[PDB]
Amino acid sequence: EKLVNYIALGEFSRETAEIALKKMPPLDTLTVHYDLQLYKINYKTQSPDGNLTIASGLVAMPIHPVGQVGIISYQHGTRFERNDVPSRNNEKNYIYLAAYGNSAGYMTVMPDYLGLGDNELTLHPYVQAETLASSSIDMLFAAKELANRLHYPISDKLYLAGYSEGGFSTIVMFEMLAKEYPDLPVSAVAPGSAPYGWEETMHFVMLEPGPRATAYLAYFFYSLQTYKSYWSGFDEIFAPPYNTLIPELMDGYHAVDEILQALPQDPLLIFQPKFSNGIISKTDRNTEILKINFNHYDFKPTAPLLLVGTKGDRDVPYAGAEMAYHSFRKYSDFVWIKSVSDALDHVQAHPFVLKEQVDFFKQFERQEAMN
Ligand SMILES: [Cl-]
């Protein structure tokens, strides 16, 4: 049993959902059909060190479903604040509930991730494949336990989506489900604007830095060194005073705009030159283990797969999505790639990408369907 405890958080109405959708075109074109009941859950999963840890997330259940209810597991993007995660259901979370739950009618399952929400680990293991995958799978299983306890019948339809860091989480979750849980059917998978490829992503974020690049890299290397100690210490990685500022900024209680204002726009300024150059040149002594963590685009998909993003992305390289697409196509014809724009950026494109995800899942909902 993974489910440890839960708390009812009240309802999320059609009317509240409609207001949220209207704020984020093109999602305003979705029709709302349901009110949802919300639960915050806590569940058992493994830490980066392979110990038991109790993590949190949100489950949202359409009330009075007209059809049999499929599950969508939605993996959120980068969060620097402990409490800005789905189990808190703040207004920024509403669009996910509105689109997937109130409109699409899916039981919507949203992990917080380790180091966030109620989890006692002090720091999120950021873009770390092993635990993003296991924490998301264990959340799904715990959510299914909740539905069983509440006599909420669900179908066997299962959809996996996410954005940004969560696009990566979605891909690694998919891989691990296929490997470790081969008898659990997955219906469709649609990672949104994910980072693909260690070299591709490092080059883009370090040398073509968009507005959040320094923050992403600070989070990534601070978290990786914290959990894995691949380098001698933080001062090998980070130039002063960022070696001590970054740990403060990443405490879970700094607003993301404050983090972005405290860090330079050019990520090279936060690193020792030796270190950053070694990463870029793949001459860092840890390059092989870094590639193992990052590179998850060479496995056989066991469900229809849509890689959806924006060619306008300045946060993660669209070239990485193109590379991943060709890699996955070696294994399956049921693989597609879609750009929602030539110029919308990572943030602007988000509601367009969400709309594509919902539409993709609906395509696979309405075939191969049996009670
Ligand atoms: Cl690589």
Side-chain angles (χ1 to χ4, degrees), residues 2-21 23-369 371:
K2 302 178 184 307
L3 184 69
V4 176
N5 49 52
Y6 71 92
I7 300 303
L9 296 180
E11 298 191 352
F12 188 72
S13 77
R14 292 165 79 133
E15 290 77 16
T16 306
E18 185 160 352
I19 291 161
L21 292 162
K23 292 175 187 177
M24 299 189 69
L27 291 163
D28 62 329
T29 66
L30 295 176
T31 300
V32 307
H33 304 282
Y34 298 107
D35 309 302
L36 317 178
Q37 171 68 54
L38 306 185
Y39 291 98
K40 170 166 75 69
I41 74 175
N42 309 92
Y43 68 95
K44 298 180 175 180
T45 195
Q46 294 296 111
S47 68
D49 289 318
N51 306 311
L52 175 64
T53 190
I54 305 306
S56 55
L58 192 69
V59 181
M61 293 171 179
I63 303 162
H64 302 146
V66 174
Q68 205 166 48
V69 179
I71 298 175
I72 190 272
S73 183
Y74 186 86
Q75 286 61 246
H76 70 76
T78 300
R79 303 292 169 74
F80 298 98
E81 303 170 42
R82 168 172 290 282
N83 289 287
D84 186 20
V85 291
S87 65
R88 284 69 177 126
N89 194 44
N90 64 30
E91 289 180 4
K92 296 182 317 268
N93 197 59
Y94 285 7
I95 196 67
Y96 312 103
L97 297 184
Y100 287 115
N102 306 82
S103 177
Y106 305 147
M107 179 173 114
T108 302
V109 175
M110 307 183 72
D112 292 341
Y113 303 152
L114 299 185
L116 303 170
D118 298 343
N119 181 242
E120 73 171 332
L121 300 171
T122 59
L123 183 59
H124 175 55
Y126 181 52
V127 205
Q128 293 182 29
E130 177 57 38
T131 55
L132 285 172
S134 56
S135 67
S136 295
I137 292 172
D138 291 338
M139 173 75 195
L140 173 62
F141 294 154
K144 290 180 82 174
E145 295 171 30
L146 178 66
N148 182 39
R149 288 165 176 268
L150 294 176
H151 294 208
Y152 190 76
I154 48 162
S155 71
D156 290 318
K157 294 283 185 181
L158 175 60
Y159 315 100
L160 311 177
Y163 199 76
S164 197
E165 183 188 12
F168 179 94
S169 301
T170 295
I171 286 285
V172 299
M173 177 184 190
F174 184 27
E175 181 181 35
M176 187 177 284
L177 283 173
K179 175 185 155 189
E180 301 188 20
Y181 302 90
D183 296 329
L184 178 64
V186 175
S187 310
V189 182
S193 300
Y196 301 95
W198 175 248
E199 184 178 10
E200 292 72 21
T201 301
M202 285 299 105
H203 285 187
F204 195 73
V205 182
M206 290 201 152
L207 296 172
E208 304 186 60
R212 289 155 291 273
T214 305
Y216 296 147
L217 291 169
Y219 199 10
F220 181 76
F221 290 107
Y222 175 57
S223 180
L224 199 66
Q225 176 65 13
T226 294
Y227 283 108
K228 305 301 180 191
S229 197
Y230 293 139
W231 297 274
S232 56
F234 295 108
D235 315 306
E236 177 178 350
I237 302 170
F238 295 122
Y242 303 105
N243 59 328
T244 60
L245 183 56
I246 289 167
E248 309 164 37
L249 296 172
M250 305 293 159
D251 68 356
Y253 297 98
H254 286 69
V256 59
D257 72 319
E258 171 175 17
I259 299 172
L260 295 172
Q261 192 56 39
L263 292 175
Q265 280 283 295
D266 180 359
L268 297 177
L269 289 168
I270 72 166
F271 292 111
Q272 283 297 336
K274 183 179 159 54
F275 180 86
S276 61
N277 292 12
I279 294 293
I280 289 165
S281 291
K282 17 309 188 300
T283 54
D284 184 277
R285 66 191 178 272
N286 300 294
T287 296
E288 291 312 314
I289 196 65
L290 292 165
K291 289 166 61 180
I292 299 297
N293 176 65
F294 219 82
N295 293 345
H296 297 271
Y297 51 85
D298 192 28
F299 63 92
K300 183 180 181 195
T302 55
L305 176 64
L306 173 64
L307 311 185
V308 50
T310 173
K311 290 173 176 184
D313 213 308
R314 304 314 306 167
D315 287 32
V316 296
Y318 198 86
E322 291 172 322
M323 170 191 74
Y325 169 75
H326 294 298
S327 183
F328 283 121
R329 289 282 290 189
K330 298 191 312 298
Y331 299 107
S332 176
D333 289 343
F334 305 104
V335 178
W336 301 272
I337 187 172
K338 170 71 175 173
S339 173
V340 301
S341 182
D342 283 344
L344 292 178
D345 75 25
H346 193 68
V347 179
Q348 298 163 328
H350 180 49
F352 296 83
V353 170
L354 181 51
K355 180 53 165 32
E356 299 298 333
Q357 292 169 329
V358 175
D359 287 342
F360 191 66
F361 296 158
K362 287 283 163 188
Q363 180 179 338
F364 292 97
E365 181 172 9
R366 71 186 182 250
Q367 61 179 83
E368 168 165 340
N371 200 69

